[PDB]
Amino acid sequence: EKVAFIGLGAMGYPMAGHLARRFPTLVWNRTFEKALRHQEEFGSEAVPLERVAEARVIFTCLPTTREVYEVAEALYPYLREGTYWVDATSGEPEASRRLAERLREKGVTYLDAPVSGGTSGAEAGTLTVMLGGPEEAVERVRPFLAYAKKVVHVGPVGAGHAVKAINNALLAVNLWAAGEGLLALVKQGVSAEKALEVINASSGRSNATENLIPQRVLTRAFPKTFALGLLVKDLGIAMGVLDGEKAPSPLLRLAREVYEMAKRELGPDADHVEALRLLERWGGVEIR
Amino acid sequence: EKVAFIGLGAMGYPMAGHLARRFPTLVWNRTFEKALRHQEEFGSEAVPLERVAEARVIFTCLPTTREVYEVAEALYPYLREGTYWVDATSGEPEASRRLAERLREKGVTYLDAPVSGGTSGAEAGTLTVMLGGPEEAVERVRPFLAYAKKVVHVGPVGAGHAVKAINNALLAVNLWAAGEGLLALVKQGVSAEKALEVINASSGRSNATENLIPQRVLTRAFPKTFALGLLVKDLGIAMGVLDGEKAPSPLLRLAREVYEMAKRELGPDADHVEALRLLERWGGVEIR
Amino acid sequence: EKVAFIGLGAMGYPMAGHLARRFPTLVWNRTFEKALRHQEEFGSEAVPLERVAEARVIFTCLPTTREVYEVAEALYPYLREGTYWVDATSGEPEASRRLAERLREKGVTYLDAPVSGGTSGAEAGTLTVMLGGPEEAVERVRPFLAYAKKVVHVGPVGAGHAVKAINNALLAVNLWAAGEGLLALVKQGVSAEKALEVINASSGRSNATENLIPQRVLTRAFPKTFALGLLVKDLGIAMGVLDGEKAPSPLLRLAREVYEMAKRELGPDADHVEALRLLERWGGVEIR
Amino acid sequence: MEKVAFIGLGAMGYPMAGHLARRFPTLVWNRTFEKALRHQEEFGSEAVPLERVAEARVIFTCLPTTREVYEVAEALYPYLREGTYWVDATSGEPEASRRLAERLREKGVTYLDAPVSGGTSGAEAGTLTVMLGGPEEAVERVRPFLAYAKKVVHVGPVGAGHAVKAINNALLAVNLWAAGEGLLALVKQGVSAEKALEVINASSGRSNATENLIPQRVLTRAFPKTFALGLLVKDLGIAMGVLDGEKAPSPLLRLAREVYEMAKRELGPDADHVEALRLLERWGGVEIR
């Protein structure tokens, strides 16, 4: 059937590409040049936002729930009953539930579907998806997830965003702690390369030490794939998840504050892994 | 040639078993019944501590450098020139360098060779070894490491212990943060099983979420393989490493304090993963 | 002119008494018994909630903004233009700003006016008031604050609540840090009494070391004046203040988590200063 | 006749030795000797080469760290006479100071750690608080010579004074920084820092930091230089050593050392300790005033 994608960003562009190669796909983006470019590259069709309502399934991958609200309100007058809204934005659980209630007024079923895998996973089409919403709706949308591999239904609306936020909080902690430790080792003469060869074959290994630090930090490449400002935004959502019960969570709480320092020192558009540059700055040595 | 192993503990017993099946091996343990048991099971030879001096390579896997010192002093009169001392204890860099100096007076070459892989890695014989010491000595001992797989030379004496401490600090942080995050998700109705299925296929994954939490926490098994007290001891050594330059290290500094709380609440002989029981206690819910 | 006071708790009862001495005063309490008692003691007049709208100045001293909202909704149909609402509740800045906007629709000017000084200060009529609101409105209500001594205009609506929350957050940090410090000194043999004599005459002094620890901890008296659960609640409001700009605030964020630990270990009913009992438990020694 | 001597005429030492100079015949020495000469002209002390310091019955030192105390002790070692007292006002290390005490004992010299609190203003007023560590007999003998102090407390054996000083400064650090985080948040939402402090200083959250440092140095934008940020970090380092004794859970104090290290790395060790708040203003994009 016909699907539509809104938000052709670092993640949305490649994600919509997989959709375009499997289904008749309509695409829209605020900066429309991206939509025209996408049409030429993948066979999708660039359309005015209003036409997105023609789709059986509408996909969004925007910065925050705030922007998803914006596009939903713009489409509200045209939305048709029986339509599904798959939101791949790393959004806010509560605001998303309110959005789902609003969409139901038009017979549109909303599901939070944030993802993990980065731009490389998006390009490969192997993104892990954490779905939140009705089981019946989940079954209906699974076949349309052409850009994913592992798809997990984690609960009702909002549960997906909650799991994504916590996942990113763990990534943040793992990455920053590794930075602190490696900086200390490098300063006393240990090869960062050697330290990681050991760590990645030991109990302290994480996706951060295995697939981010060696490739982006040791190489000094620091490619831009996920804005530091967006990671801080996710950490903020994670704090919201922690506020539910407010059980003692000193480590994750501190994580939000340290990444905020990095954001203030390096800027929101720096890559998230560049947060380690702050440690290098204070340390007076590069993790190299 | 002859090798000898001192300290048949959770790690030492299986480690010495690999040596016993490759080389003529002598074994000794403070609680001697363990040595007699080892001899019966692996074909090693239980001997008085003094006879360990007959070995070309002496291995130790004790609690701390303090105990390595105790054993070394007891052996001083018997140590023979040309002997190698491979210390698999998760020891202190500085104290080990001092010990290496005094052993060098007897013609004994000390190498810090701490390991990672846990009791399961020790049983399989796939331990990762991080060696600190002279290049020539490293090449001489490699063939005797029958309980290892990945063996990395990370620097001079003490460097091995330094890397191990940092590796364990990363494990500690990764593990606790995961606990804080999963606790929050569980309290709002999300299955830890589901959350981990997502996380272990996402960017927040780590050895802690992949191989410790599902196996020990979700199952409620909490097997005893690595004492919480020893992990706190390792964290203490890591803080010594951070003290070298004293670059801002908020996350790792906090990690030592939270695990200390767990130790004081649960006892030093609880398994290190049981630290998460403190979070379950505060949260009033089990991580499942 | 006529005034009305809502909420005759440990703070409100004496506060309304000071008002009764100067102006015709109407009083209301969730439970009538207290209002009748007040009338019989001060000459105020106990009335049904509806009559409170007859006053020129309405005062509220309730548990939280939630209750202030409840009373506001009940009085809304009766509120008259040109009326002032002075809220002495330790409320939430944001929710209170929304309330002020709602009340403005009725020509009612809301001013947040939390107090410090406790029951002793309320009884003596020497409370310190931190006012948030328009300059002209502040000048208008100053002469009505019969229960106060120091009255300070700290900013726009919400600023009073914000200062109250931050103040208690600082009290929390100062008290806990002092505990960690004193615990270490006591463990190594230093007299808690002598340590405090020095500190209280030195740069590290605070109201906590000066008027709380020596009188309540060293003596083991631990009198109940401000519940630990209430301090945690105020710390929560403080985190909300922090959330406005989200500038790096590691110390204050950590403070909320450590007091939450105390609350979960000792219970909400324990006095706030008893939080140090948790440190005593871990340290294995009393701060005395 | 009996004389006293002071080594290290710094921010603290200069005025401290001034109080001694107007009270007893005092010999003074400073690495940068021009400082010693100026002191003689200003207080009536006698600037002399380091060797003459051993002529004193009581020798005072107020140097950066125990390290400098050590090298000055070695230089004087061959001249030290039995029966002399060494009053060390340096904010030093407990353990290193104990070894120094043993070493000095070889010459019949009695060491006492006597770190102080009160800042340069307290030093000038002669109202410093002193925390003594050492033998009761020695303490009683030195009390009458502490002309720059008001409150004097014997807290224990050698090293105990330095320990209490380190913890005191750790508390100051936490109090000052937390107030900064809180004030930064308040100013950002339209709250008057001046008025907020008036309330806080009349409430439970008050501390010496909010009462006598922030209003006078930050709100005014004056940021006078009286106590180097680098030295405060050094003190926090010593405080961490005190926490290492038992290693009971101490999250707040541990974190305090890390945040001030950040400030030191960003602003430099020679900035004033209170300038650490400039880092918060930097991140906040607003000044606390």
Ligand SMILES: NC(=O)C1=CN([C@@H]2O[C@H](COP(=O)(O)OP(=O)(O)OC[C@H]3O[C@@H](n4cnc5c(N)ncnc54)[C@H](OP(=O)(O)O)[C@@H]3O)[C@@H](O)[C@H]2O)C=CC1
């Ligand atoms: N990058 C990564 O590695 C991962 C990111 N995510 C999450 O995916 C989401 C998007 O991230 P990413 O693709 O990197 O983001 P980018 O910044 O690359 O793209 C953001 C997209 O949102 C659009 N947008 C922004 N504001 C508006 C608006 N007001 N109205 C309409 N469209 C708007 C942009 O349009 P325009 O082109 O006009 O600017 C752009 O298409 C975020 O929630 C992020 O946290 C999840 C997993 C991984």
Ligand SMILES: NC(=O)C1=CN([C@@H]2O[C@H](COP(=O)(O)OP(=O)(O)OC[C@H]3O[C@@H](n4cnc5c(N)ncnc54)[C@H](OP(=O)(O)O)[C@@H]3O)[C@@H](O)[C@H]2O)C=CC1
């Ligand atoms: N367990 C794990 O998962 C891992 C542990 N390590 C490190 O390995 C080292 C040992 O750990 P683990 O095997 O779990 O320890 P255990 O507590 O199981 O064993 C400790 C061993 O040291 C011996 N020992 C203790 N005190 C003395 C002494 N005074 N003189 C002589 N021998 C003594 C014990 O003898 P006895 O039988 O008489 O008590 C025992 O053989 C530690 O440094 C630990 O941090 C490293 C990686 C993994």
Ligand SMILES: NC(=O)C1=CN([C@@H]2O[C@H](COP(=O)(O)OP(=O)(O)OC[C@H]3O[C@@H](n4cnc5c(N)ncnc54)[C@H](OP(=O)(O)O)[C@@H]3O)[C@@H](O)[C@H]2O)C=CC1
């Ligand atoms: N400032 C304050 O508010 C307080 C400081 N303290 C403690 O007092 C001690 C001194 O602080 P402060 O007075 O501010 O320090 P300053 O940096 O102002 O002065 C340090 C003094 O030590 C001397 N000095 C430095 N290195 C050497 C050396 N290698 N050999 C001989 N003399 C040396 C200096 O000599 P020169 O003139 O040649 O440079 C100077 O007289 C520190 O331990 C500090 O932590 C305690 C309470 C308060």
